[PDB]
Amino acid sequence: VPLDGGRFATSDLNDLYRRVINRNNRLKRLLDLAAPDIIVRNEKRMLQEA
Amino acid sequence: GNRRIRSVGEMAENQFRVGLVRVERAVKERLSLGDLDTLMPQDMINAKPI
Amino acid sequence: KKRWYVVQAFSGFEGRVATSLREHIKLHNMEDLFGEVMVPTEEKFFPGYVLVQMVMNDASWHLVRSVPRVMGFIGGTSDRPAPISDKEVDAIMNRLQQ
DNA sequence: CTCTGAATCTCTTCCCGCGCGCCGTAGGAC
DNA sequence: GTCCTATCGATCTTCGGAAGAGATTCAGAG
Predict the structure, then answer these.
(1) Residues C26, C40: Cα–Cα separation, whole Å
(2) Which of A42, A50, B49, C12 gets the highest tally of CB atoms within 10 A of its CB?
(3) C1-98: CATH class
């Protein structure tokens, strides 16, 4: 919803979903581009933790 | 005798100190990496953290 | 023999991290403990990671983490951080060559 | 060698309404 | 002049809650 005009007063959930979706985009990337274990154990942890 | 008054001229001195602590954490690095040949103090600090 | 390692920087200041890293090497003159520093680029993967040819002493580890705007290595643990792989280095150099 | 006692940790709860007041996404990169 | 990607991947979230209950950790021993 707008705030005082088009200043976005985001409901917080859209920051949580934005966190998830970014991590899931990066994880699909680094899987299909076949990163090694030490890299996906970064992004996979960051995703579970999001 | 164990509880003391803090008044404005002390709370603002603390919250000003937080500003100088956040300048500290920048100006040290910029002074370390910086050439110290071009730099003048107004390049070193900036008001935004205070 | 110098093996590869992955460094995380503040994403966006990556070229400045690479330059400051080369300069810290030539300051603390552990020149025999660093080979290269890679930021690959396509007409930019990887988005925020700096590749370093290196060996592992705790002195050189403190050196790379004392380079400014560097978070830390990415590995299995923080005691003995992890090199990546032979064929993975070869494939990254392949796509960098191609 | 671990079985019922007890011991340290975290999680969860904390009146109902109501009226104002303000203040509300960021350091960075072409 | 600028469109964002992003978070202490080189600190320090506050001590001045009590409680009250459970999950989870350890005694003196058969």
Answers:
(1) 22
(2) A42
(3) alpha beta
Q: Does residue A6 lie within 7 Å of nucleic acid chain D, judged by its CB?
A: no
Method: cryo-EM
A22 CB below 7 A from strand D atoms: no
Residue B9 is classified by DSSP as H
B25 touches B49 (CB < 8 A): no
| Residue type, position A22, single letter | N
Query: Residue B46: enclosing H or E segment and its boundaries?
Result: none
C68 part of contact set with chain B, CB < 8 Å: yes
How far, in Å, are B30, C2, C39, C69, C83 from residue C12 at the CA level? 17, 27, 12, 10, 24
CA distance A5 to chain C (A): 32
Instruction: Compute the distance between CA of residue A21 and CA of residue A15 in angstroms, rounded to an integer.
Output: 10
Q: Could you give phi then psi for residue C8, rounded to 5 degrees?
A: -105, 130
Ordered by start, the domain boundaries in chain C are: 1-98
3-state SS of chain C? CCEEEEEEECCCCHHHHHHHHHHHHHHCCCHHHEEEEECCCCCCCCCCEEEEEECCCHHHHHHHHHCCCEEEECCCCCCCCCCCCHHHHHHHHHHHHC
